[PDB]
């Protein structure tokens, strides 16, 4: 069973958290801080946009990932269908992806 295999690993992982959660307890003072790592009071309270810099490169992944998923037939489809008719079509998707990346060379962005 796939369901019994996945759940037994997941239930053992969450049980180890409980062991580290309930055993160590003595005092909880107003001692824990927001930023940590380096110290001092947080100048940037809560949340602020920041954004930008990688906005173009991240978007292109969402566009490219669909094509790689459409490339997944290649080792699994080429078994029954004619190869000569497929050769013109299978390469066609890979060629145009290089064309889109060639347009990505002319000003890539801020990244």
């Amino acid at each position: 069973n796939l369901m019994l295999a996945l759940l037994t690993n997941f239930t053992l992982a969450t049980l180890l958290v409980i062991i580290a959660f309930w055993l160590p307890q003595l005092n909880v003072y107003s001692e824990k801080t927001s930023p940590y790592e380096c110290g001092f009071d947080p100048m940037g309270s809560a949340r602020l946009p920041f954004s930008m810099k990688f906005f173009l490169v991240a978007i292109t992944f969402l566009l490219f990932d669909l094509e790689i998923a459409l490339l997944l037939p290649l080792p699994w489809a080429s078994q029954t269908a004619n190869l000569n008719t497929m050769l013109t079509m299978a390469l066609f998707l890979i060629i145009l992806l290089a064309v889109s990346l060639a347009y990505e060379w002319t000003q890539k962005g801020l990244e």
Binding site: N82, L83, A98
Partner: protein, 80 residues
């Protein structure tokens, strides 16, 4: 030479990985059209049966025999 040998060495000097991206991908298109071996791969692809064989009613037919080992239809014998 103006662009055949003069411009080719410029790609090797600055960003040399660009040479391999055009040469290897370029040969991947030219080779399957000219080489005399590509037609053999399609032959075995058609010969390998995925579905079960179908029996047809025989009434005056050429190159058709029983299921036993005999010369019928064609039958693949391309390389062992």
């Amino acid at each position: 030479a103006e662009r055949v040998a003069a411009f080719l060495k410029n790609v090797w000097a600055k960003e040399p990985v660009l040479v391999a991206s055009f040469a290897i991908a370029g040969l991947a298109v030219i080779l399957p059209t000219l080489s005399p071996y590509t037609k053999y791969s399609l032959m075995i692809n058609x010969x390998x049966x995925x579905x079960x064989x179908x029996x047809x009613x025989x009434x005056x037919x050429x190159x058709x025999x029983x299921x036993x080992x005999x010369x019928x239809x064609x039958x693949x014998x391309x390389x062992x």
